[PDB]
Amino acid sequence: AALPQDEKLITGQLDNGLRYMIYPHAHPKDQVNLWLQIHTGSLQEEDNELGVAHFVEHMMFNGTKTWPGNKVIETFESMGLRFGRDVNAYTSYDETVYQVSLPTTQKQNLQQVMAIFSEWSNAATFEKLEVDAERGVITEEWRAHQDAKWRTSQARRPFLLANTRNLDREPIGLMDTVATVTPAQLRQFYQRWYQPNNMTFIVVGDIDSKEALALIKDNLSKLPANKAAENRVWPTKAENHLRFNIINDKENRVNGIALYYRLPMVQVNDEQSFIEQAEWSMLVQLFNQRLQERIQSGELKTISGGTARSVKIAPDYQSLFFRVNARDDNMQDAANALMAELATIDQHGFSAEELDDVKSTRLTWLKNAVDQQAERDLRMLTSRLASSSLNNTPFLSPEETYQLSKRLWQQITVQSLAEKWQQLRKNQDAFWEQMVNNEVAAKKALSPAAILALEKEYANKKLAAYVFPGRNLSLTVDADPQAEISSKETLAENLTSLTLSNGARVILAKSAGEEQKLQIIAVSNKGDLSFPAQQKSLIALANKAVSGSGVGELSSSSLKRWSAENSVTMSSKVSGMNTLLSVSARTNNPEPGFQLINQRITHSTINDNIWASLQNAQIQALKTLDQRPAEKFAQQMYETRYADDRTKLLQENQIAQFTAADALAADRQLFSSPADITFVIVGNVAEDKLVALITRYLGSIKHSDSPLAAGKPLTRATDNASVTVKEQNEPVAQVSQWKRYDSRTPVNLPTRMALDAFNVALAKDLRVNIREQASGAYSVSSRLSVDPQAKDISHLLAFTCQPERHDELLTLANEVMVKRLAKGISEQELNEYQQNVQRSLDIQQRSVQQLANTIVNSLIQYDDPAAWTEQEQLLKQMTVENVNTAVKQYLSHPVNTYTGVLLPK
Ligand SMILES: [Cl-]
Ligand SMILES: [Cl-]
Ligand SMILES: [Zn+2]
């Protein structure tokens, strides 16, 4: 919506209307830039005042009240200030500027200079003798600087400045006006525009806010609060036809061809216009990048060089041109290279690799601009502020420029730049221009008909696409010399445990068979239950958003290319008590796998567009929840089973208040503490090369400050509830019954096997008795959940039936449960289960991904990564009485029962 002005910059206005800008800077130490900017140039001149704005500029140095004649010049010289090196002045179409650069050390010199600035504002005398002498000064300067470059721009002017006020308002004006202007006319223009409200005083340099303000208020406050004339605006009318020019000048030393486009120029004052300008800027940069790359590779031997550039032609307009410089006098070759370059872009556009190199190049410069900002060129910085003052655009800090660029450039695609290019190529306000410096080049110079015929030739050719090389991509991490392996332990036959100097744990396992795939799973003991009620629901979203973005100095697109080139894949998942970060690779190229795990942890980024989509989707989902009755009811039940603020759905405001930066900060907190991480590495790599990668990439990760305590499980509701909701407009009754059981002792691997064997048997009796029984349920479910941290087991019994049968079938499902619980398991059911699990236990050490997730599931479910290894032995140790005594101990009497019935109406 709007851009933020630099914090360092102090801007105001005095009671009399005068605007001020103060910016502190100390690259040239104890130096200050004092600029008086008049928001009036030559555009404001009347038909009988052509050159008056510039004549007035000159007359500021030729007499005032206190300093008549050349006394002002003599005064600056007494302070060691010389016109041309310390004191300057210029007039353009848009403004008149009076500039002084001087030391901050001599305080009375600063005062005298401010007193001179005061007199330039309203005390100019315009003495008749002094006026007559300047006429000559101005006339001789104009006569003397009519060189090759001046004649070239003079020749280009009618084409470039077509339909502008600027065309008819060159700052120098007419020599006839210079010779005939009366001191009264010069006085008239000066009184008209030299008024405080049309002026800005700029102060850039080694001075504090207190001192710089007192320098302004002491001298410029006294200026009478007069109102200047209103500045007029001449909007540029498009010249919607193609023009042609040939510039012949023997003094020019570069022969060539150029295509100029004329289009509006936006003022960067919001996000939309920031991007709009960046798109034009990137099309210029993309053209130059491709051209340099085609010259350096020897693909364009027929030409010298060439460039794309954009230039301001009016306050509201600009020109974007594409120039090709001819080899000696080879005009036809130059024409062919330019038209072949442009036609290629029409046909294939620019590649993602091209767009990314341009972006990464610019951001690197903007990164180095942030660091080296105190070393900025004072003149460059001062002129940049004066430009912002002129155009009424926010002055952005090097930091804010770096932030806005990375965030808003993500909105610039190969597709968005292709339409911008198509729009530009369809623009009729254009002209072809050739440059010839001899009679051989002039004869070879293309006619308008020849240019147009050449344009059609390449338009109808099926040109070959340009393959851009693309920069070498790496996620190389500098090793920590002080990173070691602290402890070693053997967990099982094929399980090794390493603890690192940073407190991280590493589980190593080799997979039998030459699959050549490596899996690294970073397991954090922090999940979404380590966050407040406003955050819980957004943690998984935040993590998906962060994992779908770039990493390190790579964009999402450069990450995709690097991933494919280095044969790697990545995924992540946010659980209630944990976060998993899965990375796959090749055993022949394992280093990239480790680099990506490290960079996802230490250098995570967030794409703003992916987060906005997840926000908007979440808001939409909340908005249209009445359209999803089952979901709505399942949510009501979730809030019924628990007495926790965290179960509640977030409102629209809560979703919007969680920003991309809040989301990036939360995701960072999960893998913030290395001591909370267990890296599961599964595959066949030479352990000596493997330990080198573990210390370099997993032992290097440092502790990051985070307030995250161990996850708090949801507070379970202390009282039972039997809810009935008549919301469905479907003739299906949906019944859910949850039974909660407390675990006196934790559920270990043998007990979970017993309880699961029982539930397989239980789910059988429910299918035969509730579903298969005539006029029964349409579906039935019997699921068993175990929460180790909460120290409880949950049993969900779900079914959908005819509404008239919901009470009868629940009664029958509960009595079937009682009967199974009393009966227990049979020898046949136990052996059925034992055979079933054994088959799955032989195919658990099959895939590198499967085995890794087995170790992971052990760590999460039993706080022991080796628990799974003792399974086959425990499976052949399971007895009828063993499971029956485990069922009687962990499923006999519930601490709570929650019932939910979703009915029609
Ligand atoms: Cl003239
Ligand atoms: Cl701008
Ligand atoms: Zn001049």
Numbering used by the authors: 27 to 931
The article reads:
To confirm the common architecture of these systems, we characterised the gene cluster analogous to the Fus from Escherichia coli: the ydd/pqqL operon. Furthermore, through structural and biochemical characterisation of the distantly related Fus homologues, YddB and PqqL from E. coli, we show that these proteins share key features with FusA and FusC, suggesting a conserved function.
PqqL consists of two clam-shell like halves, each formed from two M16 protease subunits. In contrast, in the absence of substrate, PqqL adopts an entirely open, highly extended conformation. In addition to electron density for the PqqL polypeptide chain, density was observed in the predicted peptidase active site of the N-terminal subunit of PqqL, which was attributable to a catalytic metal ion coordinated by histidines 80 and 84. In common with other proteases of this family, these residues form part of the catalytic inverzincin H-x-x-E-H motif in which the two histidine residues coordinate a zinc ion, with the glutamate additionally required for catalysis; this suggests the protein binds a putative Zn ion and serves as a metalloprotease. In order to determine if the crystal structure of PqqL is consistent with its conformation in solution we utilised small angle X-ray scattering (SAXS). In solution, PqqL was found to have maximum dimensions of 140 Å, in good agreement with the 130 Å observed in the crystal structure.
